[PDB]
């Protein structure tokens, strides 16, 4: 005598684009296997964090610059799950490197 509706939004952010994407779809139908309808993987544009800095520690030699990059990927999924699977896909959902964030209803 449990399992009411959820109105959940699971927005996952991470830098590893193969470890976040395997657990991204690892749950794409780990809910459809239990036949839950859903709006699947939403892919916000990747984030490019750039750092332009001179290579020399001093200010000698040719003025050579160097741009560094860090790319971020955040994917949100809206679910249709129960009130006891809240903590089912919470622990083996992970792979070191993927920040998991589960949200609540639209208000």
């Amino acid at each position: 005598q449990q399992q009411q509706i959820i109105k959940i939004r699971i927005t996952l952010t991470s830098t590893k684009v193969k470890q976040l994407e395997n657990v991204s779809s690892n749950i794409v139908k780990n809910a459809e296997q239990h036949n839950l309808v859903k709006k699947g993987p939403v892919r916000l544009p990747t984030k490019v964090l750039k750092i332009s800095t001179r290579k020399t520690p001093n200010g000698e030699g040719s003025k050579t610059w160097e741009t560094y990059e860090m790319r971020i990927h955040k994917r949100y999924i809206d679910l249709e799950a129960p009130v006891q699977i809240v903590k089912r896909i919470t622990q083996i959902t992970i792979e070191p490197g993927v920040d998991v964030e589960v949200v609540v209803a639209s208000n």
Partner: protein, 223 residues
């Protein structure tokens, strides 16, 4: 929470650096060879990768109690918010950092530069690595700084395979008369990759043909 996640991602990226530095410093005597923390809103889990773990834990876990208790207070993690466990590193002679520190403690014990350097190279080779290389820079009893290279096997240096198969690690060993620079280069066996490509793009292996019998004028059987 409470912040933007780009700031958050760079924030814990800085966090990994601060940690790895502190570890390479406090316990280097145990062949520490890197760490990594796992994202889990359960606990926080960092795993030490040294070569002598029993020394990392101490008397009935007394010293890891100390070590864990320290990283806790820097970021003031409520007691229980984090704990670390010591995991020995598999075949340390493939990950550069392990061998880099190895020579540091070898030269620091009075071994001949050539002898100690050559030892880790033959060790790293018989330890599995496809290739190896080590450079020693600085001064050794001679006011003029020299530099000797010691390498064995195969070693690629251009493109992406570099980021994939080569593990580098530099270490400044602070001696009596100067600061010697130790650089290590280990080439992991590509075929034995186990994660990702397993051969440099140069490798193009063709599977050879087999038996070509004569015409053997038409025949056909039924079933």
């Amino acid at each position: 929470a409470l912040i933007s996640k780009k700031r958050k991602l760079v924030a814990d990226g800085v966090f990994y650096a601060e940690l790895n530095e502190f570890f390479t410093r406090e316990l280097a005597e145990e062949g520490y060879s890197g760490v990594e923390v796992r994202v889990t809103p359960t606990k926080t889990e960092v795993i030490i990768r040294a070569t002598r773990t029993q020394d990392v834990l101490g008397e009935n876990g007394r010293r890891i109690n100390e070590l864990t208790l320290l990283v806790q207070k820097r970021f003031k993690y409520a007691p229980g918010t984090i704990v670390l466990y010591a995991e020995r590193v598999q075949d340390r002679g493939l990950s550069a950092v392990a061998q880099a520190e190895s020579m540091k403690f070898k030269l620091l014990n009075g071994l001949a530069i050539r002898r100690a350097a050559y030892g880790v190279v033959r060790y790293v080779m018989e330890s599995g690595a496809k290739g190896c290389e080590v450079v020693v820079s600085g001064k050794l009893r001679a006011a003029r700084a020299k530099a000797m290279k010691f390498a064995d096997g195969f070693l690629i240096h251009s493109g992406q395979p570099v980021n994939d198969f080569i593990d580098t690690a530099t270490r400044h060993v602070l001696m009596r008369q100067g600061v010697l620079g130790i650089k290590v280069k280990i080439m992991r066996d590509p075929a034995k990759s186990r994660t990702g490509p397993k051969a440099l793009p140069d490798a193009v292996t063709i599977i050879e043909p087999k038996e070509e019998e004569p015409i053997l004028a038409p025949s056909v059987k039924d079933y």
